[PDB]
Amino acid sequence: NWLGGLSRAAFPKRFVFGTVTSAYQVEGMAASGGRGPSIWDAFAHTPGNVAGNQNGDVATDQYHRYKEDVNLMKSLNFDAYRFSISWSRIFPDGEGRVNQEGVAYYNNLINYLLQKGITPYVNLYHYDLPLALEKKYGGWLNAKMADLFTEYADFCFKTFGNRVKHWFTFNQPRIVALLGYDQGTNPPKRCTKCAAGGNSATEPYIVAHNFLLSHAAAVARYRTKYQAAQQGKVGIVLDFNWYEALSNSTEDQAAAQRARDFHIGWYLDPLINGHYPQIMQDLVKDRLPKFTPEQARLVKGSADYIGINQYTASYMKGQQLMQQTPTSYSADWQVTYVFAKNGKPIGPQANSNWLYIVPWGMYGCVNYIKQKYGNPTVVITENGMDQPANLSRDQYLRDTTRVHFYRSYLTQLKKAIDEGANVAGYFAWSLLDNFEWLSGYTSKFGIVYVDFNTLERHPKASAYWFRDMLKH
Ligand SMILES: [Zn+2]
């Protein structure tokens, strides 16, 4: 049968199933309703930055249609919805004056979710730094972000936390560091060669450190000021794609492990163990900031659960570790990506070139965190795949590859949970086709099709798969 034995009975009692969006990717009303610009507004409006020179001005217009979309997710038997609050919709300048119309939108959305029996899981940040803060403070390069983010978080806790009980601070800080400050392909477009300036060998590490310090500060504020009354939780969302040694050679096994450490360990060792991975300390040396004992103690234990965004897997080949002039976070890993093993690709690709369909990567990631980090509470906060541009409506709706994707990846998650992994929930990226960053509207990740001419929603086969799987 098309569920492949999956149902709510196949997962733990009270296991949470949801779908996911982010503010800039779905809301629209980017320069309306009092919202100030984010670094993504400025970036997307610059010709050449995004596929087709597209932007999130309108996106899916969830801002106007949110009750339609909530009705849809309830009809598909989901328990929860992960979405983000746009910082510049609340504070158009990132600090100071509150935009009451923005606050009203999130109140309305949260209230409707609760009315319809859908639990809100709310990200405070999803790439969309207020442009004013980038210009005034230099964004995540500035340690002052901890104070600025804490004050924003405090407002959100005060304003929404009597209703919202499941928070996340950041989303994929690794990708912000990598693409914003190593490769320079996401805002602020910084890198060694870049027009905007930068240094690919130092800035990614500064940025990651500031995300960690800012997360810890916001959680300390929650715990000391809001937790007694509100009794909720705050976590963080980290991407983790699996790395598998190309062979059982000492050097290939070491490479796959170095990659895991530079990818997920970069954040998880601080959050769980209060220090950066030893290999990062060894290889990155003085370019890796040092936590003071006090900071390390603030960061350690500061996530109530770990959100993992899990999409794909790669084979890794090793090499003798060399002394080399630093060039970039990416080059610091001293690993070699390889396409195939024993003449076979690791998996077929979805629309996105980086997205290899490798269901066993889900098991790899979850088992790895279980075994290495004392089995922390994990929530799979994103998992999904994309279709290309230019298909017909019917072609989008018959998304048999995505049905197969969810059945296979969820079977692998189930395998890890049945082996004892403390996974509390799973969220599909995305509820809706939406604005996919550099790919704009050319990448379709939704279980629900959105016609970007008419803005109409139509559930795809994968949406009905979830509805069947999740029936109560
Ligand atoms: Zn509208």
Secondary structure of residue 451 in the 3-state scheme:
coil
231-234, long-range: CB < 8 A, 24+ apart? 231/165, 232/161, 232/164, 232/165, 232/166, 232/167, 233/165, 233/166, 233/167, 233/304, 233/305, 234/167, 234/168, 234/169, 234/303, 234/304
CA–CA gap between residue 54 and residue 49 (Å, rounded): 9
Scanning the structure block, which residue is given the tokens 């890796």?
Answer: 288
How many domains are there within the chain? 1
Q: How far is the CA of 28 from the centre of ligand 1 (A)?
A: 8
Q: How far is the CA of 226 from the centre of ligand 1 (A)?
A: 35
How buried is residue 276: exposed, middle or buried, by Cβ count under 10 Å (0-12/13-18/19+)?
Answer: buried
Residue type at position 146 = A
Looking at residue 291, the DSSP 8-state letter turns out to be P
Q: 295: which residues sit within 8 A by CB, 6+ positions away?
A: 213, 216
Looking at residue 278, the DSSP 8-state letter turns out to be H
Residues of the domain holding 138: 1-472
CA–CA gap between residue 204 and residue 181 (Å, rounded): 5
CATH number for the domain including 183? 3.20.20.80
CA–CA gap between residue 121 and residue 216 (Å, rounded): 19
Resolution of the structure in the document, Å:
1.6
- Whether the Cβ atoms of residue 172 and residue 84 lie closer than 8 Å to each other: no
Q: How far is the CA of 103 from the centre of ligand 1 (A)?
A: 18
Rounded to 5 degrees, what are φ and ψ at 73?
-65, -35
Q: How far is the CA of 32 from the centre of ligand 1 (A)?
A: 10
Beta strands, E only, 46-150: 80-84, 119-123
183-187, long-range: CB < 8 A, 24+ apart? 183/330, 185/438, 186/43, 186/127, 186/437, 186/438, 187/39, 187/40, 187/42, 187/43, 187/127, 187/129, 187/134
Q: How far is the CA of 1 from the centre of ligand 1 (A)?
A: 40
Q: How far is the CA of 221 from the centre of ligand 1 (A)?
A: 36
Q: How far is the CA of 33 from the centre of ligand 1 (A)?
A: 11
Q: How far is the CA of 61 from the centre of ligand 1 (A)?
A: 5
Q: How far is the CA of 59 from the centre of ligand 1 (A)?
A: 10
Pairing of strands 336-338, 313-317: antiparallel
Q: How far is the CA of 60 from the centre of ligand 1 (A)?
A: 9
